[PDB]
């Protein structure tokens, strides 16, 4: 397709030429054409093999979770909420213009619930979602019991050394290590059948009700409402933010002022992104809410099937080592043959149940994904003298200082594997949050349930709204979240978490997508998928997005000062958006296959994912000292960091340039603040351009293997505005972009020109391109250097003067270099090219008409079409006469 598809609104897609003009009648209500009702909106769209695949979801959708029976998750079929999300394949049925017709329609059904799964879902609890306005202090949660309070009691670290052997804690130096955080204050935690509030606590260390749902609605909700009342009032906001409009902006659904139940929000968020292969449609969730499931649709699915989603809790990833998997699985909750009705994901042999998915794409017949591990830990829901009551069980898993430095060794270090170990330690006359070693034998970690309460205790599963496991308001949590934990060695290597701020990526083969479909369709007990072409990576938020961190008074989440420039009030929770794959246009040594990669934005930088196209694997190298070479992180400068990542609108890739274009649109900002103040900086847009860097695979015998990861560079391109409403950005070429925007209520075309890496508006080219006189393409004027340069034809007297009269028309016509001498071209931009096309008119004469490059690098002439429609640009023709018939 010689066209650009532009989503004009939530229902309509219009086809645009490279001249930034709409193809007449191309505008299509794809919702109406999918035979869906007006409550449906376009979530995402992609081209595969010339057909258009669109993901729809409905603002009317209602889902319920019933703890008993066994079709536990269903749509609310009463009223009008039986509104599943749909993928639709459209094909263009005309050779002239655009007429979308529906080919195939696929319903995304609610997930199956096994007996085993439903025992976990029963007491599953989920944090209220993170917004734009969530503060470091909002996330902060009350520090839980120490490891020795849980095990021994109110009863002294004098008896810590005598006793740690009777509680499986041999040689453990960390009696004062935290066992997690309290669920009586903080961000609201709610079951699948409950609703999140519109209120966020300013200090979650004091003002939340956490999971104390019943406390919230009888006591604290009234307080929050009087403090933080929705705009018509104006309130004090001493204690609570009100983020209703910010919740709406991230796809939270509402019955008036009340958010719909969690299961509804999960389903609605879960149908956000699609990708398409020869055999499959894959649907995944957005970067804003955790998702617990994803669809694998078989494109052959009969004309009307219910395509079942696969649980992530049934989807085993390779985390890079078996050990990196154990760290995640051990902190999911208490496993035990001995305990009763104590059901969590770990105890029921499930794996990591939730991700904050960056996006999904396809290259060749492979699916590529990335996301953040959503924090998931056990909590103690006991009712009576249980010490950890109403407490989440979570702990830093950050590698000790003594660890073998060399990635393999850093990430497989035993520190905090089975339970708590870090807090604070003064070695010599200096200090560390990290345990200084990994004596009388090997150091032991144990799960913070004391031996006696082993058979009585109720440890259930929760899911956090961010990539942090541990919200506890201690020093280590800040250092875990911000990447500040360093060894004291030679080359001073950074010590990673493997539970907090963990990024996940992979490539998924068609067989691997087939097992997921088989897991989703499992009768009875849960079937499992293994995805083996996957990795994880400790990816903290840049420490320089915070201020005033003490060391040389220890700062925790409740006092940590955000200066985060990227649209988030918080400086501790990482975020990712716009994963996108592309084939490298740069040739490879022959007998090897084309290179491909993907990129994704995270807070403070771009990540490059590197694949080996030989066998559609993660790129790797033989040495385990150097870090999985499938991942590279390049930090942003100030200009990239100033971009509000919550305004991400779309990402395209151009195979000719080998460049990614990330579009940001400020109209996506919410109407109002957490203080209910109208947001006024919602005008404008921004483009970030991503390019590959480093030595790429298979250039020459030398680079058949690599021991340095290819990476990417994100550059705020110069294409931005604080004044215009965006309609679209057309990346015509590496040298040019067209922006369609409105100042008033009509669409204006701006041409941005790339000057040595920086895009600048070119007002003369803009005026040339915009002067199309209501046609599809820029006008042509003889006397003007316009979008088409300027052509001056030689006079007819050049034939006689050059003794070309002694040549025939047929000779001249088969000598392109003679007929390049019948004009002088002035280019409008450097290296714009032009040739003359010749036509015999008689035995003695011919005409010539120019063929001229536009900004896209394509040649146009009298016969040019877009979508089969003649452009009728207005190129001249010139007769030359007096040639011989020899
Ligand atoms: O158990 C920890 C203790 O080890 C002993 O050898 C020292 O007396 C203390 O300085 C230290 O706090
Ligand atoms: K011209």
Numbering used by the authors: 25 to 256, 261 to 412, 417 to 470, 478 to 591, 603 to 936
Direct quotes from the study:
To gain understanding into the function of the cytadherence machinery of mycoplasmas, in this study we have determined the crystal structure of P110, a major adhesin of M. genitalium and an immunodominant protein of this emergent sexually transmitted pathogen. P140 and P110, which have been shown to be reciprocally stabilized, interact to form a transmembrane complex, called “Nap”, that accumulates at a polar structure known as the terminal organelle.
In both complexes only the neuraminic acid moiety presents direct interactions with two short stretches of the protein: Pro197–Ser198–Pro199–Asn200 and Ser456–Phe457–Ser458. The carboxylate group from the neuraminic acid forms two hydrogen bonds with Ser458, one with the backbone amino group and the second with the side chain oxygen. Finally, the methyl group of the neuraminic acid is placed into a hydrophobic pocket close to the Phe457 side chain. The lactose moiety of 6SL is also well defined in the 6SL complex, while density is progressively weaker for 3SL suggesting that, beyond the neuraminic acid, the conformation of this oligosaccharide can fluctuate.
